[PDB]
């Protein structure tokens, strides 16, 4: 789901 990509991006840019 393309609408989930920015959520993933937000997560990996925290860690």
């Amino acid at each position: 789901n393309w609408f989930d990509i920015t959520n993933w991006l937000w997560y990996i840019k925290k860690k």
Partner: antibody, heavy 123, light 109 residues
Framework: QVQLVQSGAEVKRPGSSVTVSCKASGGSFSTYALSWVRQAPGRGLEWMGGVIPLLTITNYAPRFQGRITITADRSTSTAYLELNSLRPEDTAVYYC????????????????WGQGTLVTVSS | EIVLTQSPGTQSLSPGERATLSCRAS???????LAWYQQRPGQAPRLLIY???SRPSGVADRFSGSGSGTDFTLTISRLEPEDFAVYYC?????????FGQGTKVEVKR
């Protein structure tokens, strides 16, 4: 606060191409999803497509695939919609919409809307 | 393509009355990625509910969303004069996002 400002209304000839712009301010441009939604006169909302600027990943609705281009420029925090081979049926208000946040966690749904751009296809 | 059905397309209701707006999906909506928008004439849509039941800050709590799978509901606990408007549901649980056709809440007299 996130503000989206679109280019002004335009009259386009049948068969021509239109470019609508949407300049953002007040948030992070590159890592949030930006979509385009149109609304024909007296009709409902229709999702056209979107872009994630940082990744240059677009996502188009099947019925516009091959006729639209969505691009982003982080140097000006501006997103662009191109729509080609215009017909009378394409007369609509075109909205840009950015997903909301809970620089926080994105929610997918469109919290932030431009003021709309009326594109009239006519001779 | 997920088809969202909003029926009926118009509801005639009195000020102060409860309103329940239905959105039925043709297949299960992934992760309940279901949103509701309000739109007044001359204005851009406004997000009321996301993720089926989550409410953005600033949105009145008389608006509530519920449901999952294929059955979703927007409830307006008590209609204020400004609540008479058009309401759209939207699913974004697939890459192809779709809107319902909208439901107009109008004043019964």
């Amino acid at each position: 606060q996130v503000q989206l400002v679109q280019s002004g209304a335009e009259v386009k000839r049948p068969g021509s191409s239109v470019t609508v712009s949407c300049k953002a301010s007040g948030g992070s441009f590159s890592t949030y999803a930006l979509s385009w939604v149109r609304q024909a006169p007296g009709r409902g909302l229709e999702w056209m497509g979107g872009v994630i600027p940082l990744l240059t990943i677009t996502n188009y609705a099947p019925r516009f695939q091959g006729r639209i281009t969505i691009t982003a420029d982080r140097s000006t925090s501006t997103a662009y919609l191109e729509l080609n081979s215009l017909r009378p049926e394409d007369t609509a208000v075109y909205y840009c919409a950015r997903e909301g946040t809970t620089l926080g966690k994105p929610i997918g749904a469109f919290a932030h809307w431009g003021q709309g751009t009326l594109v009239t296809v006519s001779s | 393509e997920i088809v969202l059905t909003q029926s009926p397309g118009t509801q005639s209701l009195s000020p102060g009355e409860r309103a329940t707006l239905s959105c039925r999906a043709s297949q299960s909506v992934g992760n309940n990625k279901l949103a509701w928008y309000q739109q007044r004439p001359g204005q851009a849509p406004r997000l009321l509910i996301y993720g089926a039941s989550s409410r953005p800050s600033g949105v009145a709590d008389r608006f509530s969303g519920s449901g999952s799978g294929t059955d979703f509901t927007l409830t307006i606990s008590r209609l204020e004069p400004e609540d008479f408007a058009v309401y759209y549901c939207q699913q974004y649980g697939q890459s192809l996002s779709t809107f319902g056709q909208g439901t107009k809440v109008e004043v019964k007299r």
